[model samples]
Target: STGSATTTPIDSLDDAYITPVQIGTPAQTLNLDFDTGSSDLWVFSSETTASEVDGQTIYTPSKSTTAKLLSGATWSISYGDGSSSSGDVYTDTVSVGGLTVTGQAVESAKKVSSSFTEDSTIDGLLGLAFSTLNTVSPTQQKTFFDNAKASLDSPVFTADLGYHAPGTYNFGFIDTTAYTGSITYTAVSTKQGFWEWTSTGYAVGSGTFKSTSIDGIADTGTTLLYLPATVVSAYWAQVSGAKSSSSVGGYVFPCSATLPSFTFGVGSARIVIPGDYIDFGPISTGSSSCFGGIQSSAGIGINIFGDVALKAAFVVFNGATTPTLGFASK
Candidate 1:
């Protein structure tokens, strides 16, 4: 009724976390990035053009005896960076961390973007967001989590993201030992097809709490935290020598700078991200100048509590009648 799996960071910067999954008859093990930001299980596959693919492992649905084509099914997704991927679909037995779904929509990539071709670590993405965002046309498919939640012991899943170590994605049951203290849950809006919530306030390190209503989505797929420009500026204002550099594309500081921990409120509870994580290492490899994980969301028009905020807490995505988000410090 329940299962859990360990997810590992693909790089030193914790760009993404990947987990193994078994698909088809004998099982084609593919390491997929569990992304909560988007809702399409599209993968690089045998149907994809070899010239467009660099180092990613391809999923060959034809090789799997159990795989069956979903006639008239097609999907395509475009990213902000102008790159996109499009393909057809198949329904097959899919399994993850002991949890199994007899028939799940698996979109196979026919044509992929150049950026996707370069990313060698992830085979594809296992979308965890609401299925409303799913891209499959003709007969829209539910997300893997949406398909599995009803059969689980509880209609819930948890995201326990880690730094460089490892994280755990648990299905059906919440592991009490995975976190410390009580969980403070807040209502969420699935209207936008994201795990969107609000933070009552924020504090820069040990500074006095500043009350403000911050609307954002808890996105594991995103690499950094993006907030209101005012709030982000308030944060950088406290750090000496920190400046918004158009050259680096965001705020940058000397690698030797001391950064204070950042904290945000959730139902009177505070989730604190250590300063080191906020430093986010160098802007470029071997560069003494560093990039800030927290950046302005001015362009996007919405805040994003990405991996930068998630790694500091235990996050629960409750898919009950009314969706809610629960957070507990780890």
Candidate 2:
């Protein structure tokens, strides 16, 4: 049987998408961030120091008879933004929607960085990346998807991300009605444990599409679209009054400035993001300066096609031989 689930935005943050997942026996539902950028199914649990925990709901393994401790097992993970978490391991039953995985490695967080602790809405993270990246020590761990794939009619999942609206994440099947036009497929390199691929090129507004190759990962966890410094500069140049501000971070411009459309190539498909969507809103309330959603992947050498870019398309993450990504306009 197949499973389907709906994803929601975390408040007005526009950073990540969260889904309700049931863990352990008798089921304790938690709102987990479905992150394709990394691997490791970690959760805020009773193990987390009470002082370190904010408003996040904690998963209590003690309450579930199906939970078993993996003796001597430990895990630690650090994200691109320096946010991190470490914890011991427990094998438990994890059910996403109607699909269930009997023996899933569920990392219970004992330590978390301020970046994660401050975000009360995120109870944990569900890694959709390859199992090779799992953080369990000594031995590796398999994600819920990996263990459950065999039972699925099709080893595939589709991400339908919306802008300020509710979206759905479907497993083992694709809903053709959710998207328009044909889905364009591109080859992905899984060597890095990410859905990394190359796009033909990008263009700003109605400008000519440059024939450049951009390699990046399709990361649902990242909030913004990060491109090369030169590419970012070229796009920002089209926006009047736009400038890089050390004080504000990234590229910022006058709130009233007209923004240009941005498009990315996926094989022969062109996924275009509207000009209004490019304006990420004011840096702060009562401020006339707004931040550009597209930024330079300066310090981070690898580009990131984060939520900002993913939301504009219907993305298919195919877990097949030579894993590929299919994209179509939403």
Candidate 3:
């Protein structure tokens, strides 16, 4: 769950989260998640066992206007967090918006957790991250962007977060004319799943942090920024009368006073994480905390830049270009 903006998708508000899309030929309505951390598209099927679906919707073949399978190929996907899911492979008609891509890669899970199986409101997830995250072989993996890029008139794919915002969501195309100029791009390290960058320093209340800054990664899939304990402790030291909130995971400082503005350095790219982020309002009804963004980590393979970092700028991941990944702002 994201700390900055933890949004749980509710079945009652289907339109709020799931965007209707046609899978394969005879367009059938399928509800899919708008994820930015992974690639590929998935939908539940009727063939899954009762255990596989706690109560979630499993799309029946007959329910769809068109359906197909790619023999008996098996598939499994695992995340860096140790979360994994396995299923069989199939090729059917996948469609989003008015455009339909035939013979798209689809996964039908045989085993899944209650969270995945119990969500009756959700049909499946639609990963909008990158092609490198795919489980398929280097030669066989296909992402929505990889497939649609060739067919679409434009070379770019755009994610309309404005979905349910009194407007329809648009994918597979971004109107450059719709915006002002170019988006800053950053290149992803070929070895890891995260986007790495160098950290320069930390700024608080217009003051410099007493810690050394180094290289780190930006990961949307994660929910927090993992840094060294020394650096983490030094940050809390800056907060006036900051104390550890046991029940709560992060450090808490009194919010009655004016909190200082803080900015963390990422190489030459300095990301200003506002005071509100650290002082996340009162944990109790009226009591608020000033201890803004806290430092926590399980290991330090690759540091994560979650929603806290994403909201700051307009970032574009262009694997098609150079090693550089892009970043910008609205």
Candidate 4:
């Protein structure tokens, strides 16, 4: 079977993308962040503290006939942004776009961090990463992608992200018209439930390619591209007014600074991210300094190829036994 969904950016900066999901018997529609980085389908629900819930939609299990409480089950998940959510689990009729899963585990949040409460754009997160990372205790729950893989004609999904515009997530099939160039395939290592891959090299602007094998995750959930300090510093060094600022957090520069395009190699393919995508947005409302979309993953163990880089190309998350990732130009 084939299924698809439209992904819409939540903000002008394209900080995140949200897709509509229907859960339970009555089909409570909630717009959730389609996260390929994490492995939990958690949502702000009736169980969430009233104070913790802001302008977000909450899933009410009581309203659904198909909802079944998972006995003695609980889940907790934390994110790179330092935000977290945890609560009880329930099996329900879950649907994303046209794809449907009968016994999907839905983690109902009883508690959510301030970061989630503040941004009311997303109601929850639909994790597409490997099921090994699922946090449900007693038994690990399969992700939406994992649970539906058996029913799909082709066990693969594709993410086509755009700049401040709607993108697409295609399941069981790849939309050939969505991208242009031939797709390049690369082996993916699923360590700790991440779709990790080795990025061959990088180049700053029109500079020569630096052949460095860097391991990273193709995380649609994360907002920025995080790489080693040396690489990040090298990219920022080329900008006239760019500097690593602790005050602004990470790296920041004048809003008017001209940004250089960033290129990263995948197998024999090289994908270039436009300079405009690197500028990110202003540090604060009406601020003169702007935050960079690419930052240093110095203290962090894993590098993150987030929306900033993903938007530059069409990515395929192949769910084969020996899982592989594909990249194609748009």
Candidate 5:
């Protein structure tokens, strides 16, 4: 048997999507962000101090008869955005769509950063990356996918993200009807606990495609596409009135500027990101300034193919012996 779930974006922060997940014996439902960048199933829980949690639902493990505490086990995570969360661990029955995993490790948050606490809608995060990346200390935890894959007919899941629309996450099977054209498959290197791959090259608009291989990771939690400084500068150079805005931390251009299409290489496939999509809305709604969705992956040391890039195509995350990523136009 397989499973699936709908992911819907938060209007204010068009960065990530949240999907409902069931936990414990009584099956307490929580809306979690399915993050492929990190590994750890964490939730804002009853253990969280009331003062640390705001506008968010808390998972009460005590209410579930099936919850089991893993003494001495703890987890702490710091995201790229600087948001952090730390908590104790528990084993519970976790389910997504129709798939259920017994003895699933669920990290119950005891503390959370302001960024997470302020975002009331998100209850936690479900990590989709390799289990090796799990942050649990003493003993690392296993993600829902890792625990359920053995029972699944196919050890795979597809991330079907859409722009300002609801998308579906299909587990254990691929829905051919969800994508058009043939999928371009590429091998992934999980050495860093990430679905990392190298792009064959890139091009700006009608310009020439340079065969500069770029190493990057497919991250669903990140909102923007982050590449090397040189690559980012080259793309922004094509925009007439674009400039590096200190306040914006990246390049911004006149909203009326004629932006060019940006393309990235994946094996033999050339994924094109349209001009309008590159303009990540205005710097301020009423202003004529707009921020570029593509930024520099300087300090991070790794490029990120975030939602801005992933949303342009349908992605298949194959978790077999040799993990692979398949991309196709949505």
Candidate 6:
């Protein structure tokens, strides 16, 4: 494992999205999904009496000095995927390492569904992406970015996700040590702060096709990987029994024996999808179908690369130094 360090003024906004806050001591480093779609820092607490808190990580806030509830600013959100949750806003002097930020806004979701509530691995999510999608007030107030710009050493924050391990979200600084050398950085369009790009083509095994091209956006806030319908159909064509069934939409096959090595060509690079990457769990959607990690969006206008794709790359959302985003590696 690499060496880790901590400092005061733990209010790092760029990369350190979800800073761990222990109740008292036993410093357990819990990983939270750093999101920009939402404004609140919601965490599962051991104090929750809800039975649905089956496998989620809930932080005990008793250990920090800057923790307090907003009393009346509770909120609830339902995503397009039918997932929902409710929580209250609070002011906390949250700390990570030696960095401490006082009066920082946070949320504590009292109720979450099986998709999030049933999972015990994630402690909570740190809202670090953008302000436009924040559930909080948009007219009169600013997002966390506005509040944190004063403290971040650099204005940019990069999200460097690794092969399998939990990705590192850093504020103000980019760790060039994590990548082989340098990364293919892209420009973030003024449109919703999404990193935009176009796919040159796709490759199956050693075959490469350049006839088809797909414009895309890199968004970590999204969970499922979404793609255009034609792309999904073409991808499923290679596998036998792969169909667009009634219950589970997108791409799915009857068996896993036909799974093959697929690679997505973005820009000039071919991002390979390991064979086992498409293997999914049985969720009981009528009959059992072998799910491919890729899903169909039926010609959705924009390609939003969610968790499925982000988990595979080292991305740096460079919002610190300039309005532009830079992706790099160590």
- TM-score (all chains, Cα) for each model: 0.98, 0.98, 0.70, 0.99, 0.96, 0.75
Q: What residue runs in model 6 are displaced by over 4 Å at the alpha carbon?
A: 1-30, 36-38, 45-52, 55-64, 96-99, 138-150, 163-167, 193-201, 211-215, 221-223, 254-258, 281-288, 299-302, 326-330
lDDT of 3 by residue, 1-330 (tens): 000111232422112255665665455566766455566566677666677675566656655556665566665666544655666666677766656566677766665555566566667766656667766532345666556656765444443222113222344444454333455454456455434555567766677654464556655444345666656666677767876666776667777755555566543555565555444456666666543455555364555555455444444444454434444433
The number of the candidate with the highest lDDT is: 4
Report the poorest 10 consecutive residues by lDDT, candidate 4.
276-285
Q: Order the numbered candidates by TM-score, best leading.
A: 4, 2, 1, 5, 6, 3
Residue range 134-189, candidate 4, lDDT tens digits: 99998989999999998998999999998989999999998899898899999999
Assess candidate 4 and give its lDDT.
0.93
Q: Which stretches of candidate 4 lie over 4 Å from their true place?
A: none
lDDT ranking from best to worst?
A: 4, 2, 5, 1, 6, 3
Candidate 3 overall lDDT versus native: 0.54
- Please write out the lDDT profile of model 6 over residues 112-186, one tens digit for every residue: 767776555566766654554556432222344445556776665555544333455555565767666456655
| Alpha-carbon lDDT of model 1 | 0.90
Residue 182: error of model 5 in Å? 0.8
The Cα RMSD in angstroms, rounded to one decimal, for candidate 4 relative to the true structure is 0.8
Worst ten in a row by lDDT for model 6: 1-10
Relative to the true structure, how large is the alpha-carbon lDDT of every model? 0.90, 0.91, 0.54, 0.93, 0.90, 0.56
Better of 1 and 2 by lDDT: 2
- Model 2 spans with C-alpha error above 4 angstroms: none
lDDT of 2 by residue, 98-201 (tens): 88899899999999999889999899999999999999998899988888888888998888888888798888998999999999999999999999999999
Error of 1 at 121 (Å): 0.2
Q: Model 5 over residues 209-248: C-alpha lDDT tens digits?
A: 9998899999998989999999999999998889988887
Specify the highest-TM-score model's number: 4
- In Å, residue 120's CA in model 5 sits off its true spot by 1.7
